[PDB]
Amino acid sequence: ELPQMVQQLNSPDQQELQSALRKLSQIASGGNEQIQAVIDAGALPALVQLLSSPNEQILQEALWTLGNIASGGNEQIQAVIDAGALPALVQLLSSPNEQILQEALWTLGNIASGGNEQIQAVIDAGALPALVQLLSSPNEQILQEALWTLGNIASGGNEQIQAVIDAGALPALVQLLSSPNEQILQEALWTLGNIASGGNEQIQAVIDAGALPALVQLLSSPNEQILQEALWTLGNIASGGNEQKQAVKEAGAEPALEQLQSSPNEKIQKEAQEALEKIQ
Amino acid sequence: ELPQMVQQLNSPDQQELQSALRKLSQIASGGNEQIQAVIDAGALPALVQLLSSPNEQILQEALWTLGNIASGGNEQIQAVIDAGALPALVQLLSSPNEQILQEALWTLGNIASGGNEQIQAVIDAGALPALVQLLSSPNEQILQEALWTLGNIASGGNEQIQAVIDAGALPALVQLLSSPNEQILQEALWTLGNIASGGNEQIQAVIDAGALPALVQLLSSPNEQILQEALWTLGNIASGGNEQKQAVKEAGAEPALEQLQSSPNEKIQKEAQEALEKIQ
Amino acid sequence: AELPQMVQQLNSPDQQELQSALRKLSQIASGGNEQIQAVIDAGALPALVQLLSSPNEQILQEALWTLGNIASGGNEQIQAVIDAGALPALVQLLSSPNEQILQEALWTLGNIASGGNEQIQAVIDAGALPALVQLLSSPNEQILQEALWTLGNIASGGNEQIQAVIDAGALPALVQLLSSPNEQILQEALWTLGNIASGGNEQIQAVIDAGALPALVQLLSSPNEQILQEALWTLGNIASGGNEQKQAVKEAGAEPALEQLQSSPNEKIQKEAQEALEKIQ
Amino acid sequence: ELPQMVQQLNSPDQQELQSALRKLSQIASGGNEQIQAVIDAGALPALVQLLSSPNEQILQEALWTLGNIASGGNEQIQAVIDAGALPALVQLLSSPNEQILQEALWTLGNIASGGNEQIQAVIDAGALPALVQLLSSPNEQILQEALWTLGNIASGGNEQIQAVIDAGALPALVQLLSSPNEQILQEALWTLGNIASGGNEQIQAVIDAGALPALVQLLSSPNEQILQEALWTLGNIASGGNEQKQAVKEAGAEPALEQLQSSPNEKIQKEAQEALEKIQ
Numbered sequence A, B, D: 001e002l003p004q005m006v007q008q009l010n011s012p013d014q015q016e017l018q019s020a021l022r023k024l025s026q027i028a029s030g031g032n033e034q035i036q037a038v039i040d041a042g043a044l045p046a047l048v049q050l051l052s053s054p055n056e057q058i059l060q061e062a063l064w065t066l067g068n069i070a071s072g073g074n075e076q077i078q079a080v081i082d083a084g085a086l087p088a089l090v091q092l093l094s095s096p097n098e099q100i101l102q103e104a105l106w107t108l109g110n111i112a113s114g115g116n117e118q119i120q121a122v123i124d125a126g127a128l129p130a131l132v133q134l135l136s137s138p139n140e141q142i143l144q145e146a147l148w149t150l151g152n153i154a155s156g157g158n159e160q161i162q163a164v165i166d167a168g169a170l171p172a173l174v175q176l177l178s179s180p181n182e183q184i185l186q187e188a189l190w191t192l193g194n195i196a197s198g199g200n201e202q203i204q205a206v207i208d209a210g211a212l213p214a215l216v217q218l219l220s221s222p223n224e225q226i227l228q229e230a231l232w233t234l235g236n237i238a239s240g241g242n243e244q245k246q247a248v249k250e251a252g253a254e255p256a257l258e259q260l261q262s263s264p265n266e267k268i269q270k271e272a273q274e275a276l277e278k279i280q
Numbered sequence C: 001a002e003l004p005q006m007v008q009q010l011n012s013p014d015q016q017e018l019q020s021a022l023r024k025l026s027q028i029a030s031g032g033n034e035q036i037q038a039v040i041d042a043g044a045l046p047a048l049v050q051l052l053s054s055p056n057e058q059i060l061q062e063a064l065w066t067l068g069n070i071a072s073g074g075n076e077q078i079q080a081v082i083d084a085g086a087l088p089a090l091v092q093l094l095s096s097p098n099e100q101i102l103q104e105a106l107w108t109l110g111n112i113a114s115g116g117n118e119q120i121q122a123v124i125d126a127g128a129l130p131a132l133v134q135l136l137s138s139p140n141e142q143i144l145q146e147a148l149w150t151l152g153n154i155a156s157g158g159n160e161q162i163q164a165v166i167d168a169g170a171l172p173a174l175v176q177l178l179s180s181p182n183e184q185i186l187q188e189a190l191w192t193l194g195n196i197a198s199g200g201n202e203q204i205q206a207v208i209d210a211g212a213l214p215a216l217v218q219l220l221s222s223p224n225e226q227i228l229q230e231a232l233w234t235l236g237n238i239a240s241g242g243n244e245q246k247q248a249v250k251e252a253g254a255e256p257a258l259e260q261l262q263s264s265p266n267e268k269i270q271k272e273a274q275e276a277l278e279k280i281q
C-alpha cells in the first residue's frame, strides 16, 4: 500500500503530494519497524530531493520526516546519510527561515547521536563551521539547538571531539559560561563537558581556552543542576589524562616505544626516547 | 583510538607513524599538570566545603573530583591534604550510604598511595579505626576498597606499618586468608606482604597473629597468582631475624617450598629458592 | 508501532483480538482531559503561575510547556489556567527578547485561545492583541506563524471577538501576508482572514476596505490546490454577505476567475466555486 | 592473534584462562572496532559460561568484559543477547556478592539502553521482578543502579512501559519521591518521568499510584534539577492523553470504528459507537 504514497511525491498535485507527505511523515513517527517500512519503499531519495522545494510547506514536511527517520536506529540514520541528506542539510543551515533552520539543526542533531561513523559523516559533510558560526546567534532557540547538536558530536571518539575543537568552538563555549540564561549556560556546560571527557590533548585545549576560572566560579551556583555539570566537567579535567596514560600503558605502549628506541630516523628516535622517559 | 595508535607505532606509513608518536608522547606526559591547573584555578576550597554537603548527588561528584585530583603525584595529593579534606573524608567512613562510603574510601586510598608524609596525614586524621571495622563488612565492594586503602598505608615506613598493626588490623587480615573469594584473598595477602616488609617488631606481630599456618597452606594453592603473593609474603618474613626464621621453620614451610623449584613460572622458582636458602 | 497494529485488529477475524484492541482504543479515545483535571485538582496551577516570573529560563520554559499542555484540554481546563492568573504573565512574555520563551508563550496563548468565547475574550481583555499584531511583521517565521495561529483562533470566535481583532489593526498586516512567497504563512493568513470573513456584514466589509479582494482574486489562478482552496473559502465567506459586499467582489473581477474553476480536476473546488458564483447574480 | 585466546577461555589450565581472559578484556575495552574482533572470534559463548565460575577474579572479569561490549551499538548488545547472557545476568541479581550484583545490574542497564526489542529481551528474561525487589535495597549503590536500569526499560515503547507498571514498580517510585537523598530521588523521578511519557494507560497508572501530590510538592523544591524533573513529568502527564488521541485519529481509527457499527454483536457496536462519539 506504501510505494503508492511514494510515487505520489512526484505528483503534479500539492494536495496529493502533501497527502502523501503528511501520511509518510506520521508513519515515520511510529518507531523502527515503521521507519524501515518507509525506508524499504524507497522514500529517502524523494524526501532528499524535496529539500530543494520552493514550497515551504513541502519543504518543512520533508525535513520533519527526515528528522524522524533519523531518530531511530543507527542503521536507519545510515540510510538517511546514504540517501545524500547531509549536503542538503548543511546548506539549509543558511536559511533566513528560522523555522527551516531549526528543523535542519534538529535533523543534524539526531543524525549526530548515531555511532561515531554517522558523527564522522556529519563532520565530513562540512557541518562544524556553520554550527560554530551559529554559536553567535542572538536567537536563543537556534543557539540552543546548535549547542545541542555540537554536544552530540562532542560525544563521539577523541578525533570527533578534536574536530569540534579544531573548528574553533571553545572560545564561544567559554563565554557562554557567563551567560545569565541558565538554559543556554547548561547546554554549553553540557557540550563543554563532552569535550573535557576526551583525552589529554582535548582536556588541554579546554584549559588553554580559559574554562577553569569560569568553572570554578560555577561551583558557587545555588543552582544544583549547573553546579553538578561544572563539578562533572572539572572531574573529567582532573581524571582524563592519567586515565588515558594508564590505558595506553595497557594497550601495548611500553613495548611499541622500546622497538622505536632504535629507529633509523633520528627525529623519531629522540621523540621515542623522550616518550618512553614519560611512560617511565 | 588507542589500539589503533599503538599499532601505528609500527606502521610503515611514515606520516602515520610520526603523528601517532606525537599523540602518544603527549598522552605519556600524563594528567598531573592538568590536575595542577585545576588546583591553581582555585577549585580546592569549594570541593572541600562540598564534602559537608547534605546533597548526596553533589557530594558524590565532589568526592569523585577530589579522588581524581588525588590520583596525581605527591604534590597534588599534598594539596588535597593542605586543603583540609581529611577530617570530612574520615567522617564519611561512618556513612551508611554505600555509594558515598565507597567514593570516600577510594579517595582516601589515592591519598594513601603517595609518599609517607601523605600516608602519615591519613593515619593522623584517624582513618584507621574505621578502616579496620570495615574489614568485617559483609559488603565485598566496601571490604575491598578498605583493604586497598589499608594496603597503601601499609606500604609506607615502619611507623606507618606500626600504626596499622596498633589499630588491630592483623586478626582481620588473617581471618581473610580463609576467604573463598580470590579477589579479597589476594589483596589481604598483598597487605600482609607490605606489613611483613617492615622491620622486626613488624615481622613479629604478623607471626604473633597466626599468619603462618594460613600462609604456608596457601603455597599448595593451584592458583599461580595467589601463590605468588603468599610466597612473596613468606619471603618478606624469611628476610627477618633468627627467631623469625625459626618461626617459619616451625610452621612446616620446607615441604611446600621444595616442589616450587620445578615451576615453569620463572619468578616463583627464584623466590621459592630464596626462602629455603634463608631458613638455612 | 502499537497504534497502527491496534487499528488493524479492529478489522481482524478474531473476536478476542478485536475485543481487547477495541477496549484500548476506547480508553485512548477518551483522551487526556481528566488526566489534565487531576493535575489541576492536585494543586499545580498556582506553582506553575508563580514560576512564570522566574529569572531561570530553563524552569520558566518547562513551566510554560506544562501550562500550554494543561491549556490544550477542554474549556474547563483552559478556564482554570485563566482563573489561576496566567494571562498577565503570558502577555508580559510577548515582549521577551528570548525567542524560545516567546514561542512557548505564544503557543500557550494559542491553546487558551482555542477555547470557547469566554476563553478568547479573556485573552483579548488581557491586552494580547496589539503585541500579536506587531508580531505579524516579525522577520522570524517561527514567531510569525505562532502569532498568526493564535490570532486565527481568536478570530474564530464571535463577532465581538472578530471585531476586537479588526479594531487592533490586524487586517493591513494580514492582507500584506497575502503577498508572501511562503506557502505556510500564506495559508495561515488566508485561514485567519477566512475566519474574520465569517462574522457579520460589517466585519466582512472591513476585510474589503482593507484591500483583501485583489489578492484573493489572483490567488484563484494559483497552481497550488491547497492555497487555492483557502482562497476560495475566504472569498466564499465574503460572498455570503449583504448586497454591498456581493457588489465589491463583482467589481474586483471575481466572476471570470470563478468560471475558470468549474472545469477543475479537484473535488471540494467546483462545488464551492459554484456556490460562490451563485451568490452573485 | 585472538582465535586461541577463545579456546583457552575453555582450557582447564587456570593460569592461561586468566591471561586469555585479561587480554580479551583489555582489547575489548577500547573502541567498537575491537569489540567486533572479540565478537566474530566467538568469545561471547565462553564468556557467558565463565559467569558460572567459582573464581571471583574470573567471574568478575568475564562480567566486566560483557559489560564493556554491551556498551557498544545495538547489534553489539544484540550479540551479547544472542550469546545467551541474559538468564545468567538475571540469576546474578541473587548474588550475595555486592560487586558481582552491581556489575550484573550495570551490564543489564546497558543492554536495556538499546532499541525496543533489546529492552524486550531483557523483560522476557524476567529481569523486572528482580529489579522491582531491588527497589527496597538499603544499599543506595544497588538501589540507584536498579532505578537506572528500570529507567532504561521505561524508555522503550508503551508495551515496555506497561511491563514496568505490571511488574509493580510504581509504589516504590512514588515513595522515593519523598527521599531526602537527592541522587536516589532524581533517579526515581527520571524513571517515573519515562513511564509518564507513555500512553493514556501508562499516565493513568502513574496518577492512580498517587504520584501527583508528591510531584506537586516537588514544585517547591529549591533544587532546580529536581524541580525541572517534576515540571517535566507533570508536563507529560498533561499531554500524553490528548496527543495519543490525535495519534490514533491519524492512524485511521475513524474508518475502523464506523466499520464496527456493522458488527453482529451489540457490545461491539455500542463500544465502537461510544468510541467514535468520544473521539471529538
Ligand SMILES: [Ca+2]
Residues within 6 Å of the ligand: A012, A013, A014, C223, C224, C225
Ligand atoms: Ca498543481
Ligand SMILES: [Ca+2]
Residues within 6 Å of the ligand: A054, A055, A056, C181, C182, C183
Ligand atoms: Ca515558497
Ligand SMILES: [Ca+2]
Residues within 6 Å of the ligand: A138, A139, A140, C097, C098, C099
Ligand atoms: Ca534573542
Ligand SMILES: [Ca+2]
Residues within 6 Å of the ligand: A222, A223, A224, D222, D223, D224
Ligand atoms: Ca537551588
Ligand SMILES: [Ca+2]
Residues within 6 Å of the ligand: B138, B139, B140, D096, D097, D098
Ligand atoms: Ca555480601
Ligand SMILES: [Ca+2]
Residues within 6 Å of the ligand: A180, A181, A182, C055, C056, C057
Ligand atoms: Ca536567568
Ligand SMILES: [Ca+2]
Residues within 6 Å of the ligand: A096, A097, A098, C139, C140, C141
Ligand atoms: Ca527569517
Ligand SMILES: [Ca+2]
Residues within 6 Å of the ligand: B180, B181, B182, D054, D055, D056
Ligand atoms: Ca572462589
Ligand SMILES: [Ca+2]
Residues within 6 Å of the ligand: B096, B097, B098, D138, D139, D140
Ligand atoms: Ca545503606
Ligand SMILES: [Ca+2]
Residues within 6 Å of the ligand: B054, B055, B056, D180, D181, D182
Ligand atoms: Ca540529602
